[PDB]
Amino acid sequence: YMPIVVAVDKKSDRAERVLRFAAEEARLRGVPVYVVHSLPGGGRTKDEDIIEAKETLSWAVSIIRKEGAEGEEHLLVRGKEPPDDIVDFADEVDAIAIVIGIRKRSPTGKLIFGSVARDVILKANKPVICIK
Amino acid sequence: IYMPIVVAVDKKSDRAERVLRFAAEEARLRGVPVYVVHSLPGGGRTKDEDIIEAKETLSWAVSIIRKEGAEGEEHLLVRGKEPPDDIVDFADEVDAIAIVIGIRKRSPTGKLIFGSVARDVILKANKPVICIK
Ligand SMILES: [Cl-]
Ligand SMILES: [Cl-]
Ligand SMILES: [Cl-]
Ligand SMILES: [Cl-]
Ligand SMILES: [Cl-]
Ligand SMILES: [Cl-]
């Protein structure tokens, strides 16, 4: 099956909304959700970083299942930056779509993407679903 | 009674077709109609042929939606707004499930770009935005 890939940074109200939408897509299409979080994996990647990531993924998959979809955790430590990691993973598993959270920001004489969201949306070779 | 799928289309194009096909599939799965939108400002700068082309694009787009087995409606927006604000406000007004929009992906010089309308729709929207290449 071609999964829904959902990228989560941390546990947050936004992440929950992202996961709920991803679960709905998966339920409708009859495919599992692969929940991903990316770390580089060098000397800079600390114990607590990995702890938090594992907790986030465990929580995320529980949300997917509660919303009536099948979910799997995929921690990625592949020596890549997160956007490239997410995009490459999505291609590797032949994802139907990537689901990501975006910060809802009002304009301040300028209106900008976070570097991670920007690069996921633009570099992906799959549909990208952006949730606030 | 229903929360529609909103699809923003610029012109008749291969990209627009892919956008519409994805939107139709979302609509078929959810059992909701597709509202196809195109935005113009509507002052003296907006010429008659601009409006004609936009109406033709919407008519074409709805035919694609129906061919893909979904219910579609045309919604031309001439409301004195910039396209991104217009699309985002429309989606809120109709309580859309999601906005589906096309992304330009590459510039003539191979730069990774959204396209100015899609970029601002993605950032400004309150609704989920589905980005199709
Ligand atoms: Cl998030
Ligand atoms: Cl279901
Ligand atoms: Cl388009
Ligand atoms: Cl129809
Ligand atoms: Cl851009
Ligand atoms: Cl553009």
Side-chain angles (χ1 to χ4, degrees):
Chain A
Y1 285 100
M2 292 178 54
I4 296 293
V5 168
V6 57
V8 291
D9 185 24
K10 302 173 288 167
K11 299 161 284 292
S12 67
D13 296 359
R14 184 175 76 241
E16 206 197 283
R17 289 186 301 266
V18 168
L19 289 160
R20 288 197 323 253
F21 196 93
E24 179 176 70
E25 281 282 349
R27 284 191 319 246
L28 290 171
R29 293 175 190 274
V31 303
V33 181
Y34 290 4
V35 185
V36 301
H37 183 88
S38 172
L39 301 170
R44 287 172 77 161
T45 298
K46 201 166 61 65
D47 286 29
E48 281 70 20
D49 285 332
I50 307 165
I51 297 186
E52 195 185 334
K54 275 296 290 179
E55 179 163 336
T56 298
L57 286 175
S58 170
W59 165 82
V61 162
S62 82
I63 294 294
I64 295 303
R65 289 171 185 162
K66 282 188 277 289
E67 290 293 320
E70 180 192 352
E72 301 180 7
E73 309 174 18
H74 292 267
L75 180 65
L76 305 177
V77 186
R78 310 208 294 183
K80 296 179 171 180
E81 300 295 342
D84 289 306
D85 217 2
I86 291 157
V87 157
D88 290 348
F89 181 79
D91 288 345
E92 287 152 14
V93 304
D94 195 24
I96 291 176
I98 306 171
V99 189
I100 59 155
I102 304 305
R103 279 173 290 104
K104 180 38 147 58
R105 312 253 86 175
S106 51
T108 56
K110 63 173 192 283
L111 188 53
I112 64 167
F113 280 88
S115 183
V116 175
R118 172 185 271 284
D119 287 349
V120 168
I121 298 160
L122 288 181
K123 289 171 178 189
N125 298 303
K126 304 296 188 168
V128 180
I129 305 176
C130 302
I131 307 298
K132 305 303 198 310
Chain B
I1 203 174
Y2 276 175
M3 295 182 305
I5 296 293
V6 167
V7 57
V9 294
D10 183 26
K11 53 185 208 182
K12 308 203 273 280
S13 67
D14 292 8
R15 183 167 80 246
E17 286 179 350
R18 289 186 300 267
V19 168
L20 288 161
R21 287 199 294 269
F22 195 93
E25 174 184 57
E26 282 278 350
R28 281 191 327 257
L29 289 170
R30 295 163 186 277
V32 305
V34 179
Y35 289 5
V36 186
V37 301
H38 185 90
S39 171
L40 305 164
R45 73 192 78 167
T46 300
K47 47 179 171 175
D48 63 346
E49 288 188 341
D50 285 333
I51 311 255
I52 296 309
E53 194 172 35
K55 163 71 181 82
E56 280 189 56
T57 298
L58 290 176
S59 174
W60 166 85
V62 161
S63 83
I64 295 293
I65 295 302
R66 289 172 185 178
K67 183 258 275 154
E68 292 293 314
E71 181 190 334
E73 300 182 7
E74 309 177 24
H75 292 268
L76 178 66
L77 306 175
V78 186
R79 309 209 294 185
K81 294 179 175 177
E82 301 291 346
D85 292 306
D86 216 4
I87 290 157
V88 155
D89 290 349
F90 181 79
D92 288 344
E93 287 153 13
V94 304
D95 195 24
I97 295 175
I99 308 169
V100 187
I101 198 158
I103 302 308
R104 279 198 55 202
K105 194 75 155 61
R106 295 236 174 235
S107 78
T109 58
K111 304 301 318 203
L112 284 176
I113 62 166
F114 294 94
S116 61
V117 175
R119 176 199 196 286
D120 281 1
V121 165
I122 294 160
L123 293 177
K124 286 171 176 202
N126 298 305
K127 294 302 182 275
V129 180
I130 303 174
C131 307
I132 304 300
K133 293 146 218 67

